[PDB]
């Protein structure tokens, strides 16, 4: 290799890599803390009809709480709206609200997960002195979530950027060695694994070819007084991503598809309970069509929340930026939204395909028992890897200035 060998010569980039990998070692030794005042081995002996530690909740409350805050920094709450319109001064106050709402939301969701655990285990995991043991479990999981936040802030401060995304990436790629030794104990021996590897590399290059794809709109400021070195096609534009929603609609469709099985499990055994379990099966086509249509509807919704044509057209009108032929007030909003109509259909069908990929992959491969290759974790791995490597390449291309004297 050439690029990582150039990386391991620069002292700053090398120190950032050592710091990032050291904080991931800290993440793993925090992950390997069994029994936080909980059942000893009931999680191993009562799992099937699996990850449970101080990091069992993760930063998923931080993700969904920042989603709720991103929904509330609109015309719903005028206090959050004036925080968002009050410069870069009120964003810190909005992030403080995000932090405290995250703490209380994780404090609720850890108790909900504990109730689900001792309902699915029949309560035969540990005795309870009262509500204080569940409060202790909630304190432990909330402190673990805050410790993951502190590691993410350390990695986005002194490491290589995007520390929360690197923590999510490290939590994802730490289970694939267990997947590999389970599939090695499982093990057409080759000829089928070559087909699987070719399929995985084809899906990887499909995910690359969709995520690193921009539809750039030529923004021309009026401030060009003269020619004044006209290069031609100028390098200023508005790059719209093909799939602006990210991976959030997978989370929305999974949450809305597993919550009615949760309220069906709460009400006990019933005819409508068994019916809603069969119709929200997520493997049968009756539930799969519901999962796909929720993917498409919520990726249109969160794409319009993420790329917001009202605030985009207003910002282009205030800055002076226009599209050639398009007025800045409202024709710019209509033009951008009828471009985004056309882009997010492709983003919808791509993300629906990668969301329904693992069930077809397992059902037509049959060799791994529970290995989810596609889904959300593929997009997470691809995004974090590409963003970190672009960050390091930019940190070197800042350095390599040459001159003309020789």
């Amino acid at each position: 290799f050439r690029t990582i060998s150039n990386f391991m010569r620069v002292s700053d980039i090398r120190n950032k890599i050592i710091f990032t990998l050291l904080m991931l070692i800290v993440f793993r030794i925090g992950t390997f803390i069994p029994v936080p005042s909980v059942n000893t081995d009931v999680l191993k002996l009562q799992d099937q009809l699996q990850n449970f530690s101080i990091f069992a909740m993760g930063v998923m409350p931080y993700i969904t709480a920042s989603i709720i805050v991103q929904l509330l920094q609109m015309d719903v709450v005028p206090k959050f709206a004036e925080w968002s319109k009050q410069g870069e001064m009120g964003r810190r106050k909005l992030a403080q609200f995000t932090r405290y709402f995250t703490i209380v939301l994780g404090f609720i969701q850890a108790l909900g997960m504990s109730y689900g655990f001792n309902n699915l285990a029949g309560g035969m995991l540990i005795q309870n002195p009262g509500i204080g043991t569940y409060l202790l479990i909630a304190v432990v999981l909330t402190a673990g979530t805050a410790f993951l936040m502190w590691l993410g802030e350390q990695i986005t401060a002194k490491g290589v950027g995007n520390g929360i995304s690197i923590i999510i990436f490290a939590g994802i790629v730490s289970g694939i060695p267990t997947i590999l030794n389970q599939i090695y104990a499982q093990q057409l021996r080759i000829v089928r694994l070559l087909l699987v590897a070719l399929a995985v590399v084809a899906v990887i290059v499909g995910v690359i070819y969709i995520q690193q794809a921009f539809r750039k709109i030529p923004i021309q400021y009026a401030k060009r007084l003269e020619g004044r070195n006209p290069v031609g096609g100028h390098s200023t534009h508005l790059p719209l991503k093909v799939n602006p929603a990210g991976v959030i609609p997978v989370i929305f469709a999974v949450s809305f598809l597993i919550a009615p099985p949760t309220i069906a499990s709460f009400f006990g055994t019933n005819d409508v309970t068994l019916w809603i379990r069969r119709t929200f099966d997520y493997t049968h086509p009756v539930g799969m069509t519901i999962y796909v249509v929720l993917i498409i509807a919520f990726t249109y919704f969160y794409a319009f929340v993420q790329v917001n044509p009202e605030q985009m057209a207003d910002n282009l009108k205030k800055q002076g930026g226009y599209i050639p032929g398009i007025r800045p007030g409202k024709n710019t909003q209509e033009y951008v939204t009828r471009i985004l109509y056309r882009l997010t259909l492709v983003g919808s069908l791509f993300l629906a395909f990668i969301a329904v990929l693992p069930v077809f992959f397992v059902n037509f491969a049959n060799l791994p028992p529970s290995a989810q290759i596609g889904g959300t974790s593929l997009l997470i791995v691809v995004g974090v890897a590409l963003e970190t490597m672009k960050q390091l390449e930019s940190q070197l291309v800042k350095r390599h200035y040459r001159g003309f004297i020789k």
Binding site: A170, Y209, F214, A385, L386
Partner: protein, 58 residues
Amino acid sequence: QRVTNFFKEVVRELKKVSWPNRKELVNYTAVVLATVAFFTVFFAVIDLGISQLIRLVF
């Protein structure tokens, strides 16, 4: 017809996206495969090390 005209607009608009070319595509997939392979090896070594540490100290 809304459906045919809309799909013609979609397939016409997909010709104006800055897609990656072949050398950037193979460089990106080499980056992704090398990163995921290095981290499988890295977390496997740390898994074996913490397993030995919890076997010894317990």
